[PDB]
Design a protein around this ligand. Structure first.
Ligand SMILES: [Mg+2]
Ligand SMILES: [Mg+2]
Ligand SMILES: [Mg+2]
Ligand SMILES: [Mg+2]
Ligand SMILES: [Mg+2]
Lengths: 212, 100
RNA sequence: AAACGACGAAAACUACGCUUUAGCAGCUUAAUAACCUGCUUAGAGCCCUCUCUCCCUAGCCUCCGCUCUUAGGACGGGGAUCAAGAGAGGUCAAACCCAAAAGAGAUCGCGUGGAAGCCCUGCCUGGGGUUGAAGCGUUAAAACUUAAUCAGGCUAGUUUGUUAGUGGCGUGUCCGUCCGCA
RNA sequence: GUACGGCCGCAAGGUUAAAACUCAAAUGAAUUGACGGGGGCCCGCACAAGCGGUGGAGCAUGUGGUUUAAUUCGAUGCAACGCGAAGAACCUUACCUGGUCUUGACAUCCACGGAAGUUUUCAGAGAUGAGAAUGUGCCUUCGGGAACCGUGAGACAGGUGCUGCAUGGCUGUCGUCAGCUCGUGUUGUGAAAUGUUGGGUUAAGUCCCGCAACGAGCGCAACCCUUAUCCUUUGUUGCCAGCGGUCCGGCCGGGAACUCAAAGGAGACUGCCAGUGAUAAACUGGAGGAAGGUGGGGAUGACGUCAAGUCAUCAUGGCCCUUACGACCAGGGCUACACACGUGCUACAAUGGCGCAUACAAAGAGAAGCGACCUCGCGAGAGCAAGCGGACCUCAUAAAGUGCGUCGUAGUCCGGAUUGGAGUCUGCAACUCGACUCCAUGAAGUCGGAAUCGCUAGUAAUCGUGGAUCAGAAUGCCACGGUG
C-alpha cells in the first residue's frame, strides 16, 4: 500500500497497453466487460499452458484477441483446429465477429506472470516454498535479466500467520521513468488458505521510448 | 453488489425501454397547451397507474462491474475504485496519469 | 509472554528431450576445467507429424455476381501403398505474409397504369391515392402519383324523447297488502 | 564480616572469627538498540517578521449528545468530523411500519406443456391474484430442436450479518523527511565496527578532501508532464504583413511573416570571466542571455511505524441464518433537537452598496444532447424553434477595471436572512423535502476574549467563469484566468 503501481506510470513511456481501440463514452463499459470475460475464459481454458499477456483490439466492429503464451501446442491442438474451435466460442461471447492471434514467446521466463507461475503450482503440490523461491530466482536470473523483485504475502509455505517476505537479486529500480518494469501479480490456493504473489522485473535501460 | 438490488435495476431498464412511445406522446400532449382538459386528465390518470418502478427518472445509475451506487461516471460507466484499477492496468485506450 | 532456523545437500515441464561446435560470463595472479550459465549457428545420431518423390487427369482461376470464355501466375481435382531421398516444423492452424484479372452478357432479385380493401363511412358503392392486383426494363430502365368526391338499411325505426305489461333477489335474513327502477 | 568465644576500650565499638538454612546463579570488560528532568549541530510559514483570516452574528452540510420507529453503516488526536456521500422527495440506501412467499428477487439442473409475446377487464394503496381479446417467430426422421415462459421437489439460492485481532487488494500519517541495507576487504579471540564517521557545501548519504576502505541496491537528481527565447513542417473552421474590390464587414481574391493549431528540435551545462574557499567541491557577485545556478510549477512517497481505516467497491479460509438475518413493493425517516464543535459562504460599510456608457481570459461539455433566433413574461421560463460528435453552433455582452452621476456616516438606499402568498424549471408526486423568480416584513451583525490557522511571488488577498454527480438539488469538490 506504499509503492505506486508501476504499470500505471509506465503506460505512457515504454510499456504497451492491453486495450487501445476507439470508443466514445457509450460502449467502453461493454467493451471492458467483454475483454474481462474473454480473458477470464482464456485463463480457465489455458490454465495448463503458460499464458502471460492478452491484448485486445476493435478494428471496424470486429474484435481481435492476441495471446502471448509459451505452450501453443495445447491451444492449437491436433490438425490445427482447436484454435478455430475456441475462436467460435470467443466470437459467441463477444457478439461481434472475432479473430485470435498467437505470439508464442521464446525463452519466456522473463515474463512476469509465467515466472510467477508454476511456483504457485509447486506450493499447491506442497513442494518446499524456499526451494520454489530460489528456483524462480535462479531461472529469472539465468536468462539475462537485470533484477526481479517478487513479493510473497500470506502463510509462507502453508503457514498459519500471514507474513510478508520478498527476495531481490540484481537491481530493480522503481523511480526511474526509463526502466522497463514488467509487473504482475498472481494467487496460490492451498489447503490452509490463499497466498499472494507480486512480481516486478527490470528489463534494462530503454531509450527512445516507443517506436522501438 | 447486492444480488437483490442487481435485478431491480435491470427491471427498471427492461420496463422503461418499452413504454417510450406512449410516455413520449403523453408528455408532448400534456405539455402542448393546445389540448383538452378532460383528455389531459384521463391521460395523466392512465399514466399514473402504470407500474411505478418503470419510470425513466426513477432508477439510480448503477456501476457496471461492481454496482457501487455512488460515484458512477458517464465516461466509463464504472465507479472510482474500479476505474482506478482499470486505468492502472492499462485497459483504457489513453488513460495516463497526468500533469498540467 | 512468546519468534526458530535441518536434506533443489529428496531441482517437480524438458520448452521435445537426446548429441556435439565458437565465443561470453560467475569463478581467480592470469587462466582453464567441471557446469554455472544463457547465447549465434552447424550437421546428423535418434524416435518423429505434415506437404511430398505414386499414378490418373490437365486439372486449373476470376472481373458480373452464372457462363465456352481472356494477358497470366506463386493457379491447381480423385484413388491403395510408400522403397530411398527432400521442404517445413514439433499436439502449428486461421492473420502477419506475395502481385491480378480481358470481354460478351439473360438478367432472375429489383422499379410496373386504370383498380381490390382503407378516406362522408363502425356492414359496404366509391374511378378523386395507391400496391408486383394488368403491358414491362440493366448494374439499370419504356417517368409517374396509400389522399381531399356531397349523400345511403349505413351498432337500427322502440338503442335518441313520449310511454307499458310482468318473461325481477328490489329494501337491516325477511314471508309483507306497498313505496320504484325497465 | 553476623552470633558465640578471647583480647582491647569509660562507652560508642574495634579486632580474631564461624555454623545451621536458601539459590543456581552472583559478577567485570566490551558491543547493538532503547532511555535521560545530559550536551552540541542542523533543517521545514516550525518561530520571528509580515499579511489575511477562525472563535463575535444569519446560513450550509459534517461531528458528539438528546428525542424519536429509526434518526440508516463506518470514520473517533494530529493522520475522523463540507469524510466515503461526484448532489437522501418515492425509487432510493443498508433504518422503521403494515401486509405476500419458500430450491425464493436473482444463479446451472431433469419430466414435459405452451413461440416468445401485445392491448386492455376487474379486487386490493401496494405486494399479485383471477383471467380474456390474441400470436402460432425460424428449423432434423414428426420416441423435435435453439430462444423465452409454467409447474414438482431435490441437486441449489441469498445475506450492505459479523469477524480489517485470518486476509488479499487499496489508502492516510511519520515523510519527497533523508536515510535504510548489501558484496568484498580490513580491524577486534569474540559479540561487533569500518564503510554510513569528521571540515567545507547543498534540498539531499548532493559534491570534494581526509580517513581500510573499496564498490553496489532501495535511495537524491535526471530520464516523465506543462511554462519560459528561437527553428522547421503542415494553413482550416483561424491571421489579415503587403496588394484589390468592398455592402466597412477579412466577405473573398490571395498568402503562409506572424498570434493560434499539433509533430519533430536548437536550447541553461557552472558554460564564462573575478573574489572567497583547501592551487578543491562550492558560495558570492557581472557578462552574455528569453531565462542563472534546480530557470519555473506537477506526478514519481526509500526499508520500515501506527493489531492505523475499510470483510459497506470487491474477493475472501473458517461461524451464521435454509418456510428467514433470504426475498416483495407502498408510506415515512436518513433532512429532527433545550445543545457544544471542525470548515466555509455571507456582511461590519466612503477602497463601501444604488443605478447608466465601457473594456480585456484560459480551458472546457454537448445527439434520451448541446440547444442560435423570434413572439412574450417586472422576473423564473412558456410557445414556435436554425445550426452542430463541433478551431464552425450553444452554454457565454464575465467582473473586478474604467469614465460619469448619486448617497454622507446613519441598524445605514449597509447587511438578505425569517415570514404570508404568487407562479416557473424539473422529474408519475416538492406539507416532511428541491431550486429559480419577483411584489411585500426587512432578523441578526456594526472587525468579535483566551486562544488559533494559512501563506516567502505572479504566491497571499479579491473578482468572475469553467468542469464532474444527476430528472433538477453546491457556500461542498476539482480546475481556469484577471488584478496583484
Ligand atoms: Mg487462508
Ligand atoms: Mg563484630
Ligand atoms: Mg559532513
Ligand atoms: Mg548569470
Ligand atoms: Mg437522478
Amino acid at each position: 500500500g506504499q509503492k505506486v503501481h508501476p504499470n500505471g506510470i509506465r503506460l505512457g513511456i515504454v510499456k504497451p497497453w492491453n486495450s487501445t481501440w476507439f470508443a466514445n463514452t457509450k460502449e467502453f463499459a461493454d467493451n471492458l466487460d467483454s475483454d474481462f470475460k474473454v480473458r477470464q475464459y482464456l485463463t480457465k481454458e489455458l490454465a495448463k499452458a503458460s499464458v502471460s499477456r492478452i491484448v485486445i483490439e476493435r478494428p471496424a466492429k470486429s474484435i481481435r484477441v492476441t495471446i502471448h503464451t509459451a505452450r501453443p501446442g495445447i491451444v492449437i491442438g491436433k490438425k490445427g483446429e482447436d484454435v478455430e474451435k475456441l475462436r467460435k466460442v470467443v466470437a459467441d461471447i463477444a457478439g461481434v465477429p472475432a479473430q485470435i492471434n498467437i505470439a508464442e514467446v521464446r525463452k519466456p521466463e522473463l515474463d512476469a506472470k509465467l515466472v510467477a507461475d508454476s511456483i504457485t503450482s509447486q506450493l499447491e503440490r506442497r513442494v518446499m516454498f524456499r526451494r520454489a523461491m530460489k528456483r524462480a530466482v535462479q531461472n529469472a536470473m539465468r536468462l539475462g535479466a537485470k533484477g526481479i523483485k517478487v513479493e510473497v504475502s500470506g502463510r509462507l509455505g502453508g503457514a498459519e500467520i500471514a507474513r510478508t517476505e520478498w527476495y531481490r537479486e540484481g537491481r530493480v529500480p522503481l523511480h526511474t521513468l526509463r526502466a522497463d518494469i514488467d509487473y504482475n501479480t498472481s494467487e496460490a490456493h492451498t489447503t490452509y488458505g490463499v497466498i499472494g504473489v507480486k512480481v516486478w522485473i527490470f528489463k534494462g535501460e530503454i531509450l527512445g521510448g516507443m517506436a522501438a | 453488489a447486492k444480488q437483490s438490488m442487481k435485478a431491480r435495476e435491470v427491471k427498471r431498464v427492461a420496463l422503461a425501454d418499452k413504454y417510450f412511445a406512449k410516455r413520449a406522446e403523453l408528455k408532448a400532449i400534456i405539455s402542448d397547451v393546445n389540448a383538452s382538459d378532460e383528455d389531459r386528465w384521463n391521460a395523466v390518470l392512465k399514466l399514473q397507474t402504470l407500474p411505478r418502478d418503470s419510470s425513466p427518472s426513477r432508477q439510480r445509475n448503477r456501476c457496471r462491474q461492481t454496482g457501487r451506487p455512488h460515484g458512477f461516471l458517464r465516461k466509463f460507466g464504472l465507479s472510482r475504485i474500479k476505474v482506478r484499477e482499470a486505468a492502472m492496468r492499462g485497459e483504457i485506450p489513453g488513460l495516463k496519469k497526468a500533469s498540467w
